[PDB]
């Protein structure tokens, strides 16, 4: 009772299902051109083309079941884009375009071609069934059963969700399902596609897809952000909160790995935003869970000097530099500080001299407190110690009198006021540790 | 009554508004060729194409309620550029070109094609509504409420301009509005476009646009400079002013960060221009607010040795080197000084003597006074 012309978008959207369900009805048409395209793509190794082609057979079989025609149309002689030809065919012969592509919808609407636009059948995605309220991440691989990481970020437990392994076909279908969802879900985009890997932001889900030869099989890992710890949830010392609110500009959050330094920084960034500060983050790769009011830059995709310029031009109040490792990272921190931008830097270290060692070589001693003023140690998700930095004009030791005059930086415990370490220069510049 | 042929420029400008409002009238025609172009661009992921295509529907919508035709034409032998084909169509059929592109205007004029040139409504830009005479910068992001920084550099507050979040489509529309404005506004240009970022100078506004994947969402930041602190506003010692006016040639302005050293230098640079001196600046990135009489170089976009060469032929009276950090920065300052060029260097140091250490190693002691004659400390 109708003639339906399917575009590639429909073949990638499981249009065969729609036909079975009766959501769309009529004879099926596919233009020759589209099949030619799928063939070349398939030969060039496009994964989508395999899926799309496989869908053609499914369609044909279903047509046989429901007693409707299936045909491939158009002269082999005519050349052009498959979508353009398909639309032309519809105009001349009065067929209906079936698609899941908004662009095509828009063009068909303009051209006065009747169309059927496919909408997802279920609200949730395939894999979303597998997610539970307490599951952190979902792991899917060829010839493996689905599995999940469940529970606490400190105390998560691995689990199996199924009896039977997933075939390669199933995994690729899921991957495709996810690529399709980018168009549909709010705040979704392809981070980066490489030969062996694809990384995606899908709503609040993060997706990593790998394929041979990079990986031994097709693998999809889907992760969801953790519940975020608020700054208030750390019942911080009043002395400290006051400092952070009104005096701390150059901060380093330090700790041992897994001790919660990054998470604390995440919390502090959130806090500052709520105070009406403009906050930005630099991370690699981007993983923190923050509201959209805070913008997160992924350093890996930034060109040389790009971030430096952006951050100086658009001035934020605080920039959170996560996992400072490279000399370039420290340089940038210093540049920003000099420019009057507030910083929260995460350095995984066990000692203050170890946390700050990388900074000390960069600037003149008198300028150090201007780069760094506060160092916060994190242990087991709580604050172990806080150090403060100030510059004084003093002989380091009143008894030693080795240099009668000196200007020095004193690193003092927040609680004791005790100068645990001193910084000054006497040939090469060294840190002290008073008893 | 009129038959109207719309080019891509018209679609990227908001021609649908003009139609409904009656500024232009007649049937709407779009060439097949243009739609083909928009399709490919849309597929190639051009942001502009989404906007242009979305405009097509609105046009159709308005065409529906005002009893006018809407059509797409020319698919037979449709081998060429859309603009060229669309003109040809207008010539053979006597239609009218509607555009916002000066280039297209010019060609239509030559060919004797009737045309309608779209003109911005005198209201300048979408985002301009949010700007206050006292608003320092405007912040726009996807899924976020617009926010503004209000005040002066010394005194300002942070604000929410709305309680409604900003849609992703809207942000991209604004970005497009801004890219269009480069052609229209004076002293506007694209500084640099990267895959993740776009930086623009639009009149007095500085615009930074970021997109995924560099940033988590689309963000646009628009900034305007605050009123320049004059040299006179610093109530200055007569001894010093005399020195600056008549004796000082190698200068360093020093202060701790945020203590006003850069701002002072800016003031000095303007003062020297006003004294009839030729002044130039080196900054990275360029942010100082100065009149056009003073040329501002952004070192980031300069090739190796490029500034050195330009400045030695130019031989300005003073060059202001902002935020000296690298060995190359100090070397260039010394080179220029040896060449007899006056300098004003900004060194963020806590003690003036500390500003010198970086200069001291670079030259023989007897040459030192010729490099530096004056150091001004800012607190």
XYZ file of N, CA and C in Angstrom, chain A residues 119-289:
513
model
N 11.945 7.085 15.339
C 12.181 7.504 16.695
C 12.543 6.296 17.518
N 13.476 6.450 18.472
C 13.777 5.242 19.241
C 12.537 4.560 19.851
N 12.512 3.238 19.756
C 11.409 2.420 20.256
C 11.225 2.440 21.766
N 12.335 2.383 22.479
C 12.345 2.401 23.936
C 13.029 3.717 24.306
N 12.644 4.313 25.432
C 13.305 5.510 25.969
C 14.798 5.224 26.323
N 15.010 4.216 27.175
C 16.350 3.794 27.609
C 17.087 3.066 26.503
N 18.412 2.993 26.611
C 19.222 2.198 25.660
C 19.408 0.770 26.093
N 19.787 -0.059 25.133
C 19.933 -1.474 25.350
C 20.676 -1.785 26.617
N 21.856 -1.215 26.690
C 22.766 -1.477 27.778
C 22.268 -0.890 29.087
N 21.374 0.087 29.025
C 20.929 0.771 30.245
C 20.164 -0.159 31.191
N 19.544 -1.198 30.626
C 18.887 -2.268 31.400
C 19.880 -2.906 32.370
N 21.095 -3.112 31.884
C 22.161 -3.713 32.656
C 22.655 -2.861 33.813
N 22.497 -1.553 33.704
C 22.869 -0.637 34.790
C 21.865 -0.692 35.930
N 22.366 -0.677 37.158
C 21.543 -0.582 38.365
C 21.945 0.702 39.079
N 21.156 1.127 40.051
C 21.456 2.365 40.793
C 22.862 2.442 41.443
N 23.413 1.291 41.797
C 24.688 1.177 42.521
C 25.908 0.715 41.642
N 25.682 0.527 40.338
C 26.739 0.078 39.426
C 27.587 1.277 38.908
N 28.893 1.169 39.037
C 29.815 2.213 38.579
C 30.144 2.145 37.071
N 30.447 0.946 36.595
C 30.810 0.729 35.194
C 30.384 -0.639 34.638
N 30.207 -0.681 33.326
C 29.750 -1.868 32.642
C 30.798 -2.315 31.653
N 31.182 -3.596 31.672
C 32.253 -4.118 30.774
C 31.748 -5.190 29.822
N 31.934 -4.938 28.536
C 31.451 -5.788 27.486
C 32.562 -6.082 26.526
N 32.758 -7.351 26.231
C 33.790 -7.785 25.319
C 33.324 -9.025 24.570
N 33.864 -9.190 23.386
C 33.608 -10.345 22.550
C 33.859 -11.580 23.334
N 32.952 -12.541 23.264
C 33.104 -13.852 23.878
C 33.252 -13.819 25.357
N 32.677 -12.807 25.968
C 32.716 -12.705 27.421
C 31.269 -12.389 27.796
N 30.971 -12.693 29.020
C 29.671 -12.408 29.562
C 29.670 -10.980 30.056
N 28.531 -10.283 30.023
C 28.599 -8.945 30.582
C 28.926 -8.899 32.043
N 29.679 -7.878 32.420
C 30.161 -7.764 33.772
C 30.110 -6.332 34.216
N 30.076 -6.117 35.526
C 29.924 -4.783 36.084
C 30.734 -4.576 37.318
N 31.087 -3.320 37.548
C 31.811 -2.881 38.732
C 30.780 -2.219 39.636
N 30.539 -2.823 40.797
C 29.477 -2.367 41.716
C 29.946 -2.026 43.113
N 29.392 -0.938 43.653
C 29.593 -0.541 45.059
C 30.322 0.788 45.253
N 31.330 0.766 46.135
C 31.998 2.004 46.582
C 33.202 2.342 45.690
N 33.505 3.648 45.423
C 34.770 3.893 44.677
C 36.039 3.354 45.348
N 36.082 3.447 46.675
C 37.087 2.746 47.471
C 36.851 1.231 47.568
N 35.572 0.828 47.760
C 35.107 -0.591 47.927
C 34.207 -1.247 46.789
N 34.501 -0.935 45.530
C 33.771 -1.571 44.413
C 34.117 -3.061 44.293
N 33.155 -3.859 43.814
C 33.314 -5.310 43.565
C 32.903 -5.684 42.158
N 33.710 -6.506 41.505
C 33.424 -6.955 40.139
C 32.336 -8.027 40.172
N 31.544 -8.117 39.113
C 30.473 -9.126 39.057
C 30.152 -9.590 37.652
N 29.519 -10.747 37.538
C 28.993 -11.232 36.262
C 27.504 -10.973 36.269
N 26.978 -10.510 35.141
C 25.567 -10.233 34.936
C 24.834 -11.221 34.077
N 25.502 -12.217 33.502
C 24.830 -13.092 32.507
C 25.410 -14.461 32.390
N 24.623 -15.347 31.789
C 24.994 -16.758 31.652
C 25.849 -17.001 30.429
N 25.527 -16.250 29.384
C 25.992 -16.569 28.046
C 26.909 -15.496 27.510
N 27.948 -15.899 26.720
C 28.828 -14.860 26.177
C 28.170 -14.069 25.092
N 28.703 -12.876 24.864
C 28.257 -12.007 23.781
C 29.064 -12.292 22.542
N 28.392 -12.485 21.423
C 29.089 -12.672 20.183
C 29.566 -11.329 19.719
N 30.530 -11.382 18.826
C 31.117 -10.208 18.245
C 30.014 -9.362 17.625
N 29.041 -9.993 16.974
C 27.950 -9.270 16.302
C 27.178 -8.438 17.306
N 26.929 -9.010 18.465
C 26.216 -8.308 19.510
C 26.959 -7.090 19.999
N 28.266 -7.217 20.164
C 29.076 -6.106 20.669
C 29.098 -4.952 19.679
N 29.287 -5.261 18.410
C 29.301 -4.243 17.378
C 27.963 -3.548 17.266
N 26.889 -4.284 17.487
C 25.583 -3.702 17.456
C 25.405 -2.697 18.572
N 25.938 -3.013 19.724
C 25.853 -2.115 20.864
C 26.654 -0.872 20.614
N 27.818 -1.043 20.021
C 28.667 0.078 19.730
C 27.927 1.000 18.827
N 27.315 0.436 17.807
C 26.533 1.236 16.864
C 25.358 1.921 17.529
N 24.716 1.210 18.429
C 23.597 1.767 19.176
C 24.048 3.041 19.892
N 25.230 2.962 20.476
C 25.829 4.091 21.182
C 26.208 5.254 20.231
N 26.807 4.956 19.099
C 27.165 6.004 18.162
C 25.899 6.740 17.725
N 24.816 6.007 17.515
C 23.529 6.592 17.100
C 22.949 7.485 18.153
N 23.131 7.083 19.389
C 22.587 7.845 20.524
C 23.208 9.249 20.710
N 24.381 9.487 20.123
C 25.044 10.760 20.289
C 24.144 11.832 19.752
N 23.521 11.565 18.616
C 22.657 12.547 17.955
C 21.475 12.836 18.871
N 20.962 11.801 19.495
C 19.762 11.913 20.305
C 19.938 12.460 21.693
N 20.984 12.091 22.393
C 21.066 12.495 23.812
C 21.720 13.859 24.014
N 21.211 14.578 25.002
C 21.697 15.873 25.304
C 23.100 15.800 25.848
N 23.953 16.717 25.380
C 25.309 16.882 25.934
C 26.204 15.716 25.616
N 26.085 15.216 24.390
C 26.835 14.050 23.897
C 27.661 14.363 22.646
N 28.836 13.783 22.580
C 29.727 14.026 21.485
C 30.840 13.012 21.444
N 31.467 12.903 20.292
C 32.555 11.960 20.134
C 33.769 12.699 20.590
N 34.442 12.217 21.631
C 35.663 12.889 22.083
C 36.719 12.785 21.036
N 37.010 11.549 20.649
C 38.061 11.307 19.680
C 37.953 9.908 19.107
N 38.227 9.806 17.819
C 38.237 8.533 17.146
C 39.651 8.276 16.640
N 40.202 7.118 16.948
C 41.504 6.714 16.434
C 41.288 5.438 15.705
N 42.334 4.903 15.068
C 42.205 3.637 14.322
C 41.680 2.549 15.206
N 42.207 2.451 16.421
C 41.823 1.345 17.301
C 40.869 1.638 18.422
N 40.566 2.898 18.608
C 39.827 3.309 19.748
C 38.845 4.373 19.409
N 37.749 4.395 20.127
C 36.763 5.468 20.022
C 36.335 5.874 21.430
N 36.378 7.159 21.738
C 35.962 7.611 23.084
C 34.785 8.569 22.976
N 33.749 8.333 23.773
C 32.490 9.048 23.664
C 31.922 9.531 24.949
N 31.312 10.706 24.863
C 30.548 11.277 25.962
C 29.092 11.151 25.592
N 28.379 10.340 26.351
C 26.991 10.093 26.073
C 26.221 10.410 27.305
N 25.545 11.558 27.306
C 24.868 12.017 28.491
C 25.900 12.056 29.597
N 25.607 11.415 30.731
C 26.542 11.342 31.887
C 27.394 10.080 31.714
N 27.115 9.256 30.713
C 27.947 8.084 30.475
C 29.221 8.425 29.692
N 30.281 7.731 30.047
C 31.523 7.803 29.336
C 31.736 6.450 28.684
N 32.023 6.462 27.405
C 32.197 5.226 26.705
C 33.540 5.106 26.048
N 34.164 3.960 26.241
C 35.413 3.677 25.561
C 35.263 2.409 24.761
N 35.566 2.494 23.473
C 35.460 1.380 22.631
C 36.781 1.065 22.023
N 37.180 -0.212 22.061
C 38.443 -0.632 21.434
C 38.232 -1.790 20.534
N 39.058 -1.906 19.502
C 38.909 -2.969 18.538
C 40.245 -3.447 18.074
N 40.272 -4.629 17.481
C 41.543 -5.043 16.957
C 41.968 -4.109 15.874
N 43.262 -3.961 15.667
C 44.280 -4.740 16.329
C 44.787 -4.172 17.627
N 44.259 -3.019 18.005
C 44.711 -2.408 19.257
C 44.463 -3.350 20.463
N 43.275 -3.930 20.478
C 42.886 -4.858 21.501
C 42.640 -6.221 20.867
N 42.745 -7.278 21.646
C 42.536 -8.650 21.140
C 41.128 -8.933 20.667
N 40.150 -8.216 21.184
C 38.772 -8.328 20.697
C 38.089 -7.001 20.834
N 36.863 -6.920 20.331
C 36.016 -5.743 20.541
C 35.625 -5.612 22.006
N 35.853 -4.431 22.559
C 35.552 -4.148 23.960
C 34.874 -2.791 24.120
N 33.857 -2.755 24.959
C 33.129 -1.557 25.242
C 33.040 -1.445 26.708
N 33.455 -0.302 27.211
C 33.391 -0.029 28.640
C 32.607 1.230 28.816
N 31.579 1.146 29.625
C 30.687 2.250 29.857
C 30.693 2.594 31.315
N 30.971 3.854 31.608
C 31.060 4.279 32.986
C 30.173 5.462 33.253
N 29.756 5.533 34.524
C 28.832 6.553 35.059
C 29.499 7.312 36.188
N 29.189 8.600 36.345
C 29.951 9.285 37.375
C 29.497 8.834 38.747
N 30.434 8.914 39.677
C 30.180 8.584 41.067
C 29.382 9.716 41.703
N 28.691 9.427 42.805
C 28.142 10.488 43.677
C 29.311 11.376 44.108
N 29.180 12.695 43.985
C 30.284 13.574 44.364
C 30.263 13.983 45.788
N 31.406 13.908 46.417
C 31.510 14.375 47.778
C 31.557 15.913 47.837
N 30.643 16.540 48.579
C 30.596 18.014 48.720
C 31.715 18.441 49.666
N 32.122 19.698 49.611
C 33.164 20.178 50.535
C 32.699 20.136 51.978
N 31.420 20.427 52.192
C 30.812 20.392 53.515
C 30.887 19.000 54.124
N 30.797 17.965 53.297
C 30.913 16.564 53.747
C 32.247 16.245 54.405
N 33.273 16.994 54.055
C 34.528 17.020 54.784
C 34.204 18.023 55.874
N 34.209 17.659 57.139
C 33.855 18.638 58.154
C 35.120 19.368 58.421
N 35.417 20.376 57.613
C 36.741 20.995 57.697
C 36.848 21.908 58.883
N 38.085 22.089 59.324
C 38.432 23.058 60.351
C 38.002 24.470 59.942
N 37.490 25.220 60.899
C 37.008 26.573 60.651
C 38.109 27.497 60.197
N 39.288 27.340 60.792
C 40.456 28.116 60.391
C 40.695 27.933 58.880
N 40.597 26.689 58.418
C 40.871 26.349 57.033
C 39.834 26.903 56.094
N 38.574 26.736 56.447
C 37.507 27.205 55.559
C 37.622 28.694 55.364
N 37.934 29.399 56.448
C 38.092 30.850 56.342
C 39.201 31.164 55.349
N 40.301 30.420 55.450
C 41.444 30.655 54.571
C 41.065 30.477 53.123
N 40.364 29.392 52.855
C 39.991 29.090 51.483
C 39.049 30.079 50.891
N 38.111 30.502 51.719
C 37.117 31.525 51.329
C 37.735 32.890 51.048
N 38.626 33.355 51.930
C 39.111 34.748 51.852
C 40.610 34.994 51.600
N 41.520 34.029 51.771
C 42.960 34.319 51.598
C 43.779 33.420 50.644
N 43.321 32.191 50.365
C 44.114 31.198 49.578
C 43.951 31.336 48.085
N 45.054 31.571 47.412
C 45.002 31.802 45.951
C 45.775 30.766 45.160
N 46.907 30.326 45.679
C 47.706 29.331 45.029
C 47.765 28.091 45.897
N 47.006 27.075 45.498
C 46.816 25.897 46.331
C 47.316 24.674 45.655
N 47.838 23.788 46.473
C 48.169 22.468 46.020
C 47.528 21.471 46.986
N 46.799 20.539 46.417
C 46.206 19.456 47.182
C 47.088 18.245 46.943
N 47.617 17.670 48.003
C 48.557 16.585 47.889
C 48.187 15.405 48.736
N 48.741 14.296 48.368
C 48.470 13.074 49.053
C 49.167 11.943 48.382
N 48.856 10.768 48.915
C 49.254 9.544 48.317
C 48.192 9.103 47.301
N 48.578 8.203 46.383
C 47.532 7.812 45.453
C 46.409 7.069 46.137
N 45.193 7.351 45.697
C 44.004 6.720 46.225
C 43.536 7.309 47.541
N 44.248 8.305 48.054
C 43.926 8.880 49.364
C 42.867 9.969 49.286
N 42.402 10.256 48.082
C 41.319 11.201 47.880
C 41.686 12.639 47.511
N 42.931 12.879 47.109
C 43.376 14.219 46.716
C 42.625 14.798 45.533
N 42.444 14.001 44.507
C 41.672 14.461 43.361
C 40.227 14.760 43.733
N 39.625 13.875 44.508
C 38.215 14.047 44.873
C 38.007 15.294 45.734
N 38.979 15.593 46.599
C 38.912 16.785 47.412
C 38.948 18.001 46.542
N 39.848 17.987 45.552
C 39.985 19.102 44.574
C 38.716 19.319 43.768
N 38.084 18.223 43.410
C 36.823 18.267 42.752
C 35.831 18.988 43.652
N 35.829 18.617 44.926
C 34.925 19.242 45.918
C 35.160 20.743 46.139
N 36.426 21.086 46.243
C 36.813 22.455 46.381
C 36.429 23.296 45.168
N 36.603 22.739 43.977
C 36.202 23.434 42.754
C 34.729 23.732 42.719
N 33.941 22.750 43.100
C 32.518 22.907 43.224
C 32.123 24.009 44.237
N 32.817 24.016 45.362
C 32.567 24.974 46.406
C 32.779 26.373 45.934
N 33.880 26.552 45.245
C 34.228 27.873 44.730
C 33.215 28.356 43.710
N 32.708 27.432 42.909
C 31.731 27.802 41.901
C 30.498 28.332 42.553
N 30.103 27.647 43.605
C 28.897 28.037 44.348
C 29.021 29.368 45.050
N 30.241 29.722 45.423
C 30.503 31.056 45.928
C 30.421 32.152 44.880
N 30.162 31.791 43.626
C 30.064 32.753 42.542
C 31.395 33.071 41.897
N 32.361 32.175 42.069
C 33.636 32.270 41.364
C 33.506 31.562 40.007
N 34.311 31.976 39.058
C 34.356 31.320 37.767
C 35.470 30.293 37.866
N 35.110 29.037 37.644
C 36.049 27.929 37.818
C 36.176 27.131 36.549
N 37.402 26.720 36.278
C 37.723 25.936 35.115
C 38.683 24.865 35.558
N 38.784 23.818 34.759
C 39.627 22.721 35.090
C 40.478 22.358 33.906
N 41.688 21.879 34.194
C 42.545 21.264 33.210
C 42.798 19.811 33.651
N 42.461 18.828 32.824
C 42.679 17.431 33.187
C 42.997 16.581 31.972
N 43.569 15.401 32.204
C 43.965 14.519 31.135
C 43.985 13.035 31.502
N 42.953 12.298 31.101
C 41.836 12.849 30.368
C 40.791 13.355 31.294
N 39.771 13.952 30.739
C 38.759 14.572 31.543
C 37.926 13.523 32.205
N 37.871 13.517 33.538
C 37.086 12.510 34.263
C 36.275 13.013 35.448
N 36.611 14.175 35.977
C 35.910 14.692 37.147
C 34.434 14.881 36.815
N 33.619 14.755 37.830
C 32.187 14.910 37.748
C 31.859 16.299 38.278
